[PDB]
Amino acid sequence: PTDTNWFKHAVFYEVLVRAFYDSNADGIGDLRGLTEKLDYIKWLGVDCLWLPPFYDSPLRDGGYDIRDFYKVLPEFGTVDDFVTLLDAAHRRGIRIITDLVMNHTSDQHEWFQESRHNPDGPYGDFYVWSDTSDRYPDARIIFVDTEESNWTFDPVRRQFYWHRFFSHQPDLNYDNPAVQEAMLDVLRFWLDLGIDGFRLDAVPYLFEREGTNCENLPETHAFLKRCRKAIDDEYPGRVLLAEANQWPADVVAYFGDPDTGGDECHMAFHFPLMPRIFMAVRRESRFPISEILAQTPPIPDTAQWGIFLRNHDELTLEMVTDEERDYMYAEYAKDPRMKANVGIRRRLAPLLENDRNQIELFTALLLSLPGSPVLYYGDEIGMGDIIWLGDRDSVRTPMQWTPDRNAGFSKATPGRLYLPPNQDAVYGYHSVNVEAQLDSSSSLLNWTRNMLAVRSRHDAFAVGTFRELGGSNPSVLAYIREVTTDAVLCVNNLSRFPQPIELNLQQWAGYIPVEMTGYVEFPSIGQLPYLLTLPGHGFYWFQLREPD
Amino acid sequence: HPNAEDFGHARTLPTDTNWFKHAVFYEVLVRAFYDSNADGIGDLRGLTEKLDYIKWLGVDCLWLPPFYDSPLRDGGYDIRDFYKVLPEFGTVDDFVTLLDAAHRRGIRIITDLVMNHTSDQHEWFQESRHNPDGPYGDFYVWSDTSDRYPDARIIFVDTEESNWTFDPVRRQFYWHRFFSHQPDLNYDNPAVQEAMLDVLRFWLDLGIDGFRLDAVPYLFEREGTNCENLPETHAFLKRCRKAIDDEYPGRVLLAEANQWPADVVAYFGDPDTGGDECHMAFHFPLMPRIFMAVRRESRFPISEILAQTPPIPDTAQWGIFLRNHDELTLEMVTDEERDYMYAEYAKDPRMKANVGIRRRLAPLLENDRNQIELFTALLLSLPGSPVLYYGDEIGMGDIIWLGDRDSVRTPMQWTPDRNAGFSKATPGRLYLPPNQDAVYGYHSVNVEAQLDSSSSLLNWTRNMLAVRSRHDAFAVGTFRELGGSNPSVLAYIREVTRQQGDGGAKTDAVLCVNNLSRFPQPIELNLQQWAGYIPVEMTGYVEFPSIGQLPYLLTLPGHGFYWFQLREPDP
């Protein structure tokens, strides 16, 4: 049932098929397992699942190296299990989007094997081949510590092929019109199955051109317009999300032509948000947050920013920044917490040293700042990570359902699990798990669920305007979200100590602030500045109720 | 009996007749704190080694439950020799060494002393029953029948069939308010009175800073009375206070009288002399009332017991603590006639389940950190001298199956090492085991783990004690409850009467605001008398807007609290 704005009102939940629930005791999470846990997901109150790549893959780069776009990784199930999942989610009002890597395939993909073995055949030009490694010299090597070059010599074809990512991930040749059609057909295949949309990954790198750094080319945007057009024409109500790990000013291009109301991606991610919030709290100053928001350009009214509490892009493990436009550019390296975690994904609780007050503060900001928020699976119970598993796999350990064997994720033997659960005294499944948190109304899980329920009752959080209120105290960030008569006031203390703030709310004189969890009515707003007092790292949400 | 001279003595601190009013006490069991000799049992030498932690924490006086020689049938409240420490704990010499080391750091020590009764293994009782016409013949209360004092209740009614027990050797009944193995001393025998004063003098000569006198309401019995709170009992307490003040100025007597506050006031003595009995007594109903105030999200249960608490002598001070039960009898104080919450405790399922069992703070509050902070804030800011129980500062749990008292007497959890770092002995030799569950176990909850993060409960508690220590109003200030629009919020101001050295933050008034609701609450306060003053929040030192003629609006998160110094305005 089409609702062309659903993505603006959605809370997304990024969940890995491999990690959520193993229904068949092979030690690996699967589609049937995820289907069996949909009642939990509905109960939590999220609106759309975001599944990282689950296609057939040799898994040398986390499944971002795809061997077959048309096939589910066999240990997850088949496309039939995927449709079962889709139907069960839809039946509960939950949508599903997935990652789709557009720039490159695994070298195990049959297209590449045909390209190298049969250069004269129909796949001969499906990839970017050269007698020399000299072309495109201005393109940086993304994985500079691992790849000596963006060109690799193939021993079968005896020419170099191009890859922006690892050598086992050859780039598709988008100047070949058969490649463009083949990739459009991949989109249609999953859309026909009923998927609600895609996050398109690595799209800034589609086209290469001499004289350029081979990112963000106009031909790249042109292909994205084809994708959007195919969606608009054939599957209305579906969504395209861009993964462009760039400064927000540069990302706005990915929404497309403003005069059209946006003709490329419906959404794109605002990557610098979490690094700025993290630094605002470290510095006890609202300015890193105020500034990043104020400097973010307007986007088409059809579009929406995606936001999440992570410091790194999951594809490249890089944190966005900009020498010229980021006033905090040199500051990140001066923070020992940021410095220790460079290039490693970490979960929310570990990022905040398990401080429950800060977890709540960061989560409140995620749920009230402009954009559609993405929650990462397990953050709602305060799961930890295991950094030694890898820069990405750190945060991909099994969902911790119960304090039972394997955290209740699987009936297999522990040695057969795809990755082990946390076992330490702080984050281990004996103390951190869904079951333990279900009872108390004061658990992080129940708190998170309640915050989602509150957010869902106020359209202002999803699509409202954003007005930062300033105020006497630079340690406090206060703002109003407004839709036109749903008006909400959010006040956030970035300081570890109690703070007073006096706000000029004269425009809303007469209005009565009603705090959104206890529904207590606060003193009516007058002509004098309104005094609010917050504990360290505290926050309040108020509905601004019109007078009688 | 040993003769004091035969031992060393601790060096005395400069006498300070009001030290106990400013003190935060720390109740710590010798058996539980630290085992220095790998026998699985905490000891005096071990406690001495841990004085550095105690000093760092910032408490002013240790309160040690009984450590005398005892067969330990009733937790050591059954004393076999008043002049001897239980051998597993060490000797009198070790106690003197502990006292000296504590005194070096400015830390005092008091101990429990049971006045009403001894173990039946005490030699006085063995002599009393074997040799009736000897000098101990009337040291206890003997009778040919079990008919005397019928109006006295049986305290342990589910265990003891009578307050009289027939002795097989003497063939007469002897009286005991507590268990049958704890015969009552006969205070009508002046030799008993002198013997007990001699016990006090023994420990005072060694250098102890005072005593909590246990079971004192039950000293004397008289026909036609319920045998509690008799005039002769109070008269004996005046002797103890007289001996204390004449011979050892600057020491303290605390009364353990588990009674309604209007009734325990008598234990401070004659108000006309400024108080001539105990310097201190416990305000037992405070925690049950705070507990109820939070359960009902209303300030009134707290407001009311405070308002109904009668004034006490100028030299005197209430003791307060976050427990619902007296450790001696495991009873919660109540009063059918005078407690308006009398029937309400039995309606609360948490209160109900824990009847007669000591529980630690974190377990009482289901490990809710915000509530632990709220209750701790109240303990540290309400009138009285507070007692912290060892381990509550790190959020230790308890083990209820160990017994109604032993639940809270498990080893101090120092580290996540073997035996929680309490001992090098094998685990099977520990006097009691540490908590081992996922919530409160020593792998998760221990001092070492909390020392690092400035956001741990330990560091928070230590900072709160530091803040309290720098503001006299918390210790000896007046108490002015402020009312307010919102019944869910308890607000009060505490003030020092000046003199000598005037201002400074140390003597400025303090404002405390406490949210008993689990939801954010506004409160508007009429603080017009403090117009112009600037509230400065005590932990972060942020200046809040100056007080004016309008009501002052403060907003609190669920279960939150603020402490403010009221600073006088610039001229």
Ligand SMILES: C[C@H]1O[C@H](O[C@H]2[C@H](O)[C@@H](O)[C@@H](O[C@H]3[C@H](O)[C@@H](O)[C@@H](O)O[C@@H]3CO)O[C@@H]2CO)[C@H](O)[C@@H](O)[C@@H]1N[C@H]1C=C(CO)[C@@H](O)[C@H](O)[C@H]1O
């Ligand atoms: C997020 C919020 O969680 C908690 O709030 C909940 C309660 O503690 C539960 O008892 C439950 O309350 C209700 C009764 O059970 C039900 O009978 C109903 O009719 O009355 C209640 C409905 O108000 O549910 C509560 C939420 O509805 C925790 O207590 C609370 O303080 C936490 N609050 C924060 C959220 C916001 C955003 O509005 C901020 O304003 C706050 O400062 C946060 O602290």
Ligand SMILES: [Ca+2]
């Ligand atoms: Ca490319």
Ligand SMILES: [Ca+2]
């Ligand atoms: Ca007696």
Ligand SMILES: [Cl-]
């Ligand atoms: Cl996966």
Ligand SMILES: [Cl-]
């Ligand atoms: Cl398939």
Ligand SMILES: [Cl-]
């Ligand atoms: Cl990402």
Ligand SMILES: [Cl-]
């Ligand atoms: Cl991250």
Ligand SMILES: [Cl-]
């Ligand atoms: Cl002991």
Ligand SMILES: [Cl-]
């Ligand atoms: Cl007690």
Ligand SMILES: [Cl-]
């Ligand atoms: Cl208790």
Ligand SMILES: [Mg+2]
């Ligand atoms: Mg499986």
Ligand SMILES: [Mg+2]
């Ligand atoms: Mg020992």
